[PDB]
Structure 1
Amino acid sequence: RKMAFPSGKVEGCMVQVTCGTTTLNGLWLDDVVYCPRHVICTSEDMLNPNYEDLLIRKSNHNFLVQAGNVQLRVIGHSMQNCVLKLKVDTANPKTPKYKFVRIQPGQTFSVLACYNGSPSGVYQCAMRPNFTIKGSFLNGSCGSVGFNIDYDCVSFCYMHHMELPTGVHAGTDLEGNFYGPFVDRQTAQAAGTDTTITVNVLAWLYAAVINGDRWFLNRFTTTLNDFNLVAMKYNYEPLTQDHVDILGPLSAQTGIAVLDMCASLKELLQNGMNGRTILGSALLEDEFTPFDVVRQCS
């Protein structure tokens, strides 16, 4: 099952930001509120925004920040890439230990979907190789964040900006740099062709074996290069030696060598699932990392 991190440390940081007719979510850490810079645009501005130009024309008073029922006064404002940083008169007393990280494609995070500064739901997402995420985000969700938690330190890695016409989602890191070749302009945008996260599919096949599902195994073995030739053919990402090492502990637990699991994956791509399921899925799942599997399989 996908499992999210407990969200309380992030819930205490969510606020609402309004400018003009537009209300979205912001993240309140110490005395700064971070939010998507498109909060400043009208529906006409979004068609083609010169963001600086819109920004020079706003004052601190054009921003209304609400934390619960209490208003926070904006004393300053600046822009870092596609993120607005609103300095407020009150530091957040509930600020957790935190870091801003830019995540790698294939890594997972928890998303706290929020509307009007109020948390609604929590779920796991993976950063796709084409730098989109398959999330659940409706009107009003912009500025919701993604994060991982290590002990009590929250590593924020995503802030939500956009939904593409295909229904997938795009956003930035907390420095305001988009994942992927996207821009915060209301013009038609498509992602690059997506590919399957090979190391994650392998981690998930290990989870399946751990949970008793083993129909897909064989004694066929393969070399790493021969596996990658097939992976490339089927639009799977390359598997590196680093990935092989990362699968080590799962390989030890099941007694199935990484390259033997590669050989099983190769057969599944070439001759499909035969109307069978793995872990209840009719598809090969690639949104669990090795770390996500081992955290649940012990």
Structure 2
Amino acid sequence: FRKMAFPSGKVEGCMVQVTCGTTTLNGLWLDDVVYCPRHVICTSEDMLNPNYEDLLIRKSNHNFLVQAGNVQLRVIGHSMQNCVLKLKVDTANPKTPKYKFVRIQPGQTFSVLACYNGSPSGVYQCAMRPNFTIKGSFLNGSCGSVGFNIDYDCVSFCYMHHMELPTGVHAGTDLEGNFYGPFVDRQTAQAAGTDTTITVNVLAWLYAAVINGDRWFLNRFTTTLNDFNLVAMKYNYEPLTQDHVDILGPLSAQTGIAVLDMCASLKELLQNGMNGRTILGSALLEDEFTPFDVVRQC
């Protein structure tokens, strides 16, 4: 198994750059709207604690430079929705895919198209951590880069990049401008909660091992969801939700191993360790492959 991203072409056709003064970041051009982080309107000095409502009242459409490549797109309206700026432009993007805006849950994965000056540089797979940070690869000028999933014809945009935390992890918003986690778009020292292991993905990984014939860790017992959750928390594993149990359904069906039986096997691994054994050629349990990701590669 490797981290595999979605093909990025449909998102590449939507990337633009947005400039205020000398501050340039990336924006997302869908139909006749460009979406970008609101701190494009901040002077580097006013990022310490911005008054965004006041900064925006001083702004007019003609203060925003939006370019697709070197081609200017005229702005004909502007508004702020939470931490994102919406710029109405006079041209509908002819490359607009079928799309939706979704708010993902911790543990879910997505592809990130890292962009600079509206030009894509690379694509990679990310997982949203339980503490609502992602372990991205972002440099200055990357803000406005987006995270997405593709289902059939349709791009689901789930993430827009806004900042780096002191520990080197990244934080941002959905495409409605609502931050993931307790973060704010201010150049102030902020800390994420202690991270935990994404239990539902570890289970998916154990199912994947079974599908490939590596099944030494299966035991003869089961557990309740509540007993498993209380034990899991003592090992800094995320508790399982009902949605987690449901998304493991297809893999449970494929293998014939009930979700709660796999939980009992995982509890034994937590309590007894690997005792020098490997699973899928690894002594470490992987937690950034979702049940969908496993199916995508099996």
How far does the alpha carbon of each residue in 1:176-215 deviate from its partner, in whole angstroms, 9 at most, with x for none?
Answer: 1101110000111001222222111101111122223334
Residues 34 and 229 of structure 1: CA distance in aligned 2, closer, same or farther (over 3 Å): same
In structure 2, the residue matched to 1:199 is 200
Q: Could you state the TM-score of these two structures normalised by the residue count of structure 2?
A: 0.94
How far does the alpha carbon of each residue in 1:117-143 deviate from its partner, in whole angstroms, 9 at most, with x for none?
Answer: 011111121222211111111111100
Shift of 1:258: 2.1
Residues 86 and 244 of structure 1: CA distance in aligned 2, closer, same or farther (over 3 Å): closer
Shift of 1:52: 1.2
Shift of 1:84: 0.7
State the secondary structure of the residue aligned to 2:120: strand
Residues 71 and 241 of structure 1: CA distance in aligned 2, closer, same or farther (over 3 Å): closer
In structure 2, the residue matched to 1:211 is 212
Q: Which shifted more, 272-281 or 254-263?
A: 272-281
Q: Could you state the TM-score of these two structures normalised by the residue count of structure 1?
A: 0.94
Shift of 1:233: 1.3
State the secondary structure of the residue aligned to 1:228: helix
Instruction: Give unpaired runs (5+ residues) of structure 1.
Output: none
State the secondary structure of the residue aligned to 2:262: helix
Shift of 1:115: 0.9
In structure 1, the residue matched to 2:94 is 93
Q: CA RMSD in A?
A: 1.6
Residues 96 and 55 of structure 1: CA distance in aligned 2, closer, same or farther (over 3 Å): same
How far does the alpha carbon of each residue in 1:227-256 deviate from its partner, in whole angstroms, 9 at most, with x for none?
Answer: 222112112222244433432321232233
Q: Which shifted more, 225-234 or 247-256?
A: 247-256
Residues 219 and 134 of structure 1: CA distance in aligned 2, closer, same or farther (over 3 Å): same
Distance in 2, matches of 1:283 and 1:229, equals: 22
In structure 2, the residue matched to 1:44 is 45
Distance in 2, matches of 1:78 and 1:258, equals: 46
Distance in 2, matches of 1:216 and 1:35, equals: 47
Shift of 1:257: 2.9
Distance in 2, matches of 1:146 and 1:75, equals: 27
Distance in 1, matches of 2:18 and 2:282, equals: 40
Shift of 1:60: 1.9
Q: Which shifted more, 82-91 or 238-247?
A: 238-247
Shift of 1:223: 3.0
Distance in 2, matches of 1:246 and 1:66, equals: 41
Q: Percent identity, please.
A: 100
How many pairs align?
Answer: 297
Q: Which shifted more, 283-292 or 111-120?
A: 283-292
State the secondary structure of the residue aligned to 1:171: strand
Distance in 2, matches of 1:259 and 1:163, equals: 38
Shift of 1:17: 0.9
In structure 2, the residue matched to 1:56 is 57
Q: Which shifted more, 92-101 or 204-213?
A: 204-213
Shift of 1:163: 0.7
Distance in 1, matches of 2:99 and 2:242, equals: 31
State the secondary structure of the residue aligned to 1:45: coil
Q: Which shifted more, 218-227 or 108-117?
A: 218-227
Residues 200 and 89 of structure 1: CA distance in aligned 2, closer, same or farther (over 3 Å): same
Distance in 2, matches of 1:10 and 1:234, equals: 39
Shift of 1:281: 3.7
How far does the alpha carbon of each residue in 1:42-78 deviate from its partner, in whole angstroms, 9 at most, with x for none?
Answer: 1110011001111112222221111023111122211
Instruction: Give unpaired runs (5+ residues) of structure 2.
Output: none
How far does the alpha carbon of each residue in 1:125-164 deviate from its partner, in whole angstroms, 9 at most, with x for none?
Answer: 1222211111111111100001111111111111000110
